[model samples]
Target: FPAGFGWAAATAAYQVEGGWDADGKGPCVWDTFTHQGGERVFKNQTGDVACGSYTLWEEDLKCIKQLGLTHYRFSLSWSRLLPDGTTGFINQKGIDYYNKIIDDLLKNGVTPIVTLYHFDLPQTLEDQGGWLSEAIIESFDKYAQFCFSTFGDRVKQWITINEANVLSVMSYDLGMFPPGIPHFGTGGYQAAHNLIKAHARSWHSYDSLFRKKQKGMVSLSLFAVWLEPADPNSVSDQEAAKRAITFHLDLFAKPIFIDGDYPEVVKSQIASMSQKQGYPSSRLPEFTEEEKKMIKGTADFFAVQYYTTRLIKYQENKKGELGILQDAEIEFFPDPSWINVDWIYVVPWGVCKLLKYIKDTYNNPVIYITENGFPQSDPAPLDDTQRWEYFRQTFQELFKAIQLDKVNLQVYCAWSLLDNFEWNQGYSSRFGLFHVDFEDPARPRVPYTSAKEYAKIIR
Candidate 1:
């Protein structure tokens, strides 16, 4: 690690805590979707009582101290604070709960990195069109400003949105998450457009009202996946890779990083596809010049959540097309030697490659690995040899990114400190260093072998 850099671990509120509606906390989309009829993709899967972190947080904190980490990154459940997703009503109990947790971390000599939103939207908001509605932009800004006014003093670092790309595309376009609507080729574009605007508005709210007083930095957490062409020499393959990168990274980053709007390639590709589908105009929305200026350079740092890389190849077959060329008519092949997990492949060297790409592409802002870890479902006592090996190799690759590739990396945070709700996958995929005994209502958390290895690395 560099001189002033630090190591940390992360966890999300919905993923860990079981008492979803306890203490007057309002229901979030995850709560309603997982419990409602046929909403969850997985069988018998709901985060209602996953990990039971609401009561087991003290034990989790012990693990943090044991790991010798200098920081811990966690998210605040919006529904917990404002049950209706509006700031009109505040829950004192919820405030006390977070305050206690923050106090404990500070007292233990660990800095708290707080994320305002990590996928879980208030159910009330979803009932009124969710991110698909422009009104959500105002609602989100109000919630963010409330958080700044309330928690700004204690929490110095803030992440406005976690995985904005995934949140917008997955929930709206692909229908992979809550309020699942397969509007990708049509209405989904509206959803994504609204989400980006909401993010930009929330960022501006923080920058205008809170940054000077709190002296804190707010940035979006992006789940950045590297794209490589199947045949580097083939122009078609090269274009496919570029399209994939632009759609994934630049689609969101471009607007936030530069002054104007989304890339022209995205606009033209979506327009052509829509025309072929008998639509009059492109499904994707266009940004005004003023909106473009408002979003540029909104971030203070880049919080990268990288896990794997994708191999891209052009496909001539145009069946069930989505909104963008990157989304429609493309084939994705897995890396042969890449580390295997059910959802994501572990490509250690991709970390270095991604960092270098970010530096070259985005002018090398201060970078932090907000979330990176392997998942294993092996039952505890979990001997996570593969997890440890993955961590060591990935960290070594990050070191190379800094030393050799000249990437300005600052901090590295493991995906999770303990196994909690794995979203749709549930407990079937365990990404935590400490395995929580979900079978036990108490949700006993025991350290996996990787935790011990992490302790040594942190020391």
Candidate 2:
């Protein structure tokens, strides 16, 4: 672990809070999506009443205090705050609720780290095409500006958006998320374009309006996976891995850190796919010179959310012409040894490599691990040995990255403080340091074995 660095745990408003419609809060896309039916989620489970953290805030904070954490990161539900995407209709109850939580954390000596958006957008905004519309960029900027103007005084660290990569791919391309728009060909590109633009707009708003006064740092949280070339020497395999990174990491990072434009690999792949599919132009949107400047150097820090790694290779057998591999024209495979519950490989070295890559490529911005944890299948007692092992190995690799690889590591926040919503998998995957009894009405959180280890690390 990095010396003198703070340790913390995280949660989100919707995932833990059960009161979905209490206190005049409007519905979010997730609220509608999960409540719709089994067509989108597994077992038709919703987070409307998951852990009930809204009422259990005091109980949850008690856990944070018990763990002796220095930082607590959670997200603000956009729908809960704005209710209908309009600034005029502010939810006083939502604001009051968050105020109490923030004040309580300060009283307990725990710094509050807030993420403005965490995969849950006001359903009203989604109706207007969500991140697919340029208007949403302005909307997001307005929302962020309101946040900085109001809550920025208390919350010093802020994340503009959480995991925009997964937001685009899962919502538009994969069709597994809300809106269920299965148009990877065009819809995915548009969604990604709007997200990048929206993030840039929000950052500029905060920098221009709030940074001078609030003196807060703002950054985007990126969900990253380590990619390796299947055939290290083969040009095609190397290119495929590069494309994978372009599609995943550079899609979001390049605009904020590098040249403020989409990667060339994305351009080439989009063009190649559009040609094969007989399209007029590339599906990916192009940015103007002024827009590029606005996006460049937007990030005040790098918030990384890493889970696992994947292996990439060029496929020899090209059967059809319009699948994920064919559209991107890249073959990929998961590393065999790093298996997890959802087929994700538990490769700690990947984190070291990814950190080094970020340092070398992005000029080594202050890095904060926004989310990192392992998921288990069973609710085997509180002694989560496997989770502890995952933490130890990952931290050791992180130490190597800082000491030998010379990466600028700043802070680390575990994925969760307690087991909560696992998304479509519901409560099946457990990635928390504390265990939550879902069957219990209060959703009381209990300490797991990893909690003690985490406490030691923090101390």
**On residues 1-459, what C-alpha lDDT tens digit does candidate 2 reach at each position?**
666676778898778887889898899988989877964666787898888888888988988998898899999888888999879799988898889889999999899899999888899999997878888998898898888887988889998889998888778777778877677566767887888888888898988898888898999899898889986887888987877787888888988888899888788767766666677776777888989988888899998899888888876434436534235766667766556778557888889999998898788788999898887775565877866887899999988998998788878899888788877778777777788888868787888888877888775
Candidate 1, residues 394-416, lDDT tens digits: the string is 98998899999888898899998
Question: In candidate 2, what residue range of length 10 has the lowest lDDT sum?
Answer: 317-326
lDDT of each: 0.83, 0.83
Clash pairs detected, candidate 2: 338-345, 338-346
User: Model 1 scores what on Cα lDDT?
Assistant: 0.83
lDDT of 2: 0.83
Report how far residue 43 has shifted in candidate 1, in Å. Answer: 2.7
Provide TM-scores for the models. Answer: 0.96, 0.96
